């Protein structure tokens, strides 16, 4: 059901949607969205689980 | 009126400034800047 309600159909579209949700106003692009997604939960600087 | 927004005289020469004075100063500065830029005939985006 979640996949049915999901509008995105590819990794790039999902990344663009995530970037738009996180940083509204700024023009979404592949590089910025990819960097934001990688640094959100997979970077030792921004994210740190004790 | 100034007494409704008084400047409390503090020890050492400092003066306690109420938030109303700061807001009025900000408004006055913005108005003066807008007038100066209108006098200079700034482009549409800057004046907007």
């Amino acid at each position: 059901e979640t996949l049915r309600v999901d509008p995105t159909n590819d990794r790039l579209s999902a990344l663009v949607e995530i970037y738009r949700m996180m940083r509204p106003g700024e023009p979404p692009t592949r590089e910025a969205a990819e960097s934001l997604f990688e640094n959100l939960f997979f970077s030792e600087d921004r994210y740190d689980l004790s | 009126p100034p007494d409704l927004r008084p400047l409390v005289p503090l020890d050492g020469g400092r003066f306690a400034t109420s938030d109303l004075n700061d807001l009025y100063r900000r408004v006055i500065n913005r108005n003066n800047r807008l007038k100066r830029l209108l006098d200079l005939a700034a482009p549409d985006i800057i004046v907007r």
Binding site: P24, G25, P27, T29, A32 | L40, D44, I45, I46, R48
Partner: protein, 162 residues
């Protein structure tokens, strides 16, 4: 694909922001006024930023993102008319490239013949004519007795602009 944007800089940080942006390889534009006069003196003919705290940047968002421009060691913020940053037309930039004829009008006028208020001594609350700009750190004023007016050198900060 390169486009023009306008951003507001921090107070007294235009040079640092411009240097950082030029390091980041983005075209920078800022009107400069040289024929400006202030009570400070010291060869008043010196380049000053016309339209202060405003800087135009030409760049392609794909090459460098707008968030990088937002935080570039001196750039206060972007000029946003809504959610997205505002994009100036190329006509405005082309006009501003050759618009500047140098502007005579200045916030402070040390020119001769301009009335100047005195706030010290028995002359407090009175206006006096300006003689001429002599010296750099200070300028002389024509004090006004009832009998007649006579010139005399005063400190630049001693007198106030009327």
């Amino acid at each position: 694909m390169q486009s023009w944007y306008l951003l507001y800089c921090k107070r007294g940080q235009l040079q640092r922001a411009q240097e950082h942006l030029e390091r980041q390889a983005v075209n920078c534009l800022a009107p400069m006024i040289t024929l400006e006069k202030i009570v400070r003196g010291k060869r008043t003919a010196v380049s000053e930023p016309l339209f202060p705290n405003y800087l135009f940047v030409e760049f392609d968002p794909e090459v460098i993102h707008t968030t990088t421009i937002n935080a570039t060691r001196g750039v206060s913020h972007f000029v946003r008319f809504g959610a997205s940053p505002a994009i100036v037309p190329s006509a405005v930039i082309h006009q501003l490239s050759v618009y500047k004829p140098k502007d005579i009008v200045d916030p402070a006028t040390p020119y001769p013949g301009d009335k100047v208020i005195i706030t010290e001594g028995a002359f407090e609350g009175f206006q006096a004519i300006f003689t001429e700009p002599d010296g750099e750190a200070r300028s002389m004023l024509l004090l006004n007795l009832i009998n007649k007016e006579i010139k005399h050198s005063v400190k630049n900060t001693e007198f106030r602009k009327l």
